[PDB]
Amino acid sequence: ANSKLTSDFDNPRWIGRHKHMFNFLDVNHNGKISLDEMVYKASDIVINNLGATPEQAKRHKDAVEAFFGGAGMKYGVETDWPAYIEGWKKLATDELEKYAKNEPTLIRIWGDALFDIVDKDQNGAITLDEWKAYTKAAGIIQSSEDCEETFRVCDIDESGQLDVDEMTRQHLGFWYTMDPACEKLYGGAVP
């Protein structure tokens, strides 16, 4: 019964969750962001902060390129807020369709590529310390307390780890469907 698989695009809390992220991504307050910037940020984090090998970094870049690409972003194009949020409606729709058909989603492909870098053991799950390292390098969470709230919201495994399958589920609820069970996934960092 639990999980919510229907989009909720007219919910002001959905629009506002993505506007928060648009603003967080628009670090110089240009009112527009490009695919060039998104793939730069992605590879800067993994290579310069998280120890990615060259092959790992390239995999991660392809996943991020495809993800924001699915939201309509392109190299050499500056995407403003109205174009961004309409593109996000298309991304969320396509992702929910793939998920319902048991086909790999762009968010899962990104998770797999990131977790290969972030999980010291390369077995598809991360410790709280590893989650702190990733999110604080990206900047999506600033405080340890918000990082800890992720581990409250998510189902944590028998070793105290957040597995990529569970986090993919949580991301569908949080980014795509406004599932009430996924609120506070990023603590107070992302409304």
State the residues that interact with ligand CZN by CB under 6 A: 18, 21, 38, 41-42, 64, 88, 107-108, 110-111, 114, 138, 140, 164, 167-168, 171, 175
Distance CA 130, CA 81 (A): 32
Residue 125 beta carbon to ligand CZN: minimum distance, rounded to whole angstroms: 10
Closest approach, Cβ 21 to ligand CZN, in A, equals 3
Of 14, 18, 60, 110, the catalytic one is 18
Q: Which residue, 55 or 68, has its beta carbon nearer to ligand CZN?
A: 68
Contact 71, 87 (CB under 8 A): yes
Residue 161 annotated in ligand binding: yes
| Strand 32-34, strand 78-80: pairing | antiparallel
> What minimum distance in Å lies between the beta carbon of 189 and ligand CZN?
9
Q: Which of 88, 99, 110, 175 is catalytic?
A: 88
Residue 191 to residue 19: CA distance in whole angstroms: 10
Residues 6+ apart with CB under 8 A from 89: 7, 9
- Dist CA 80 CA 26 (whole Å): 10
Active site residue ranges: 18, 88, 134, 171, 186
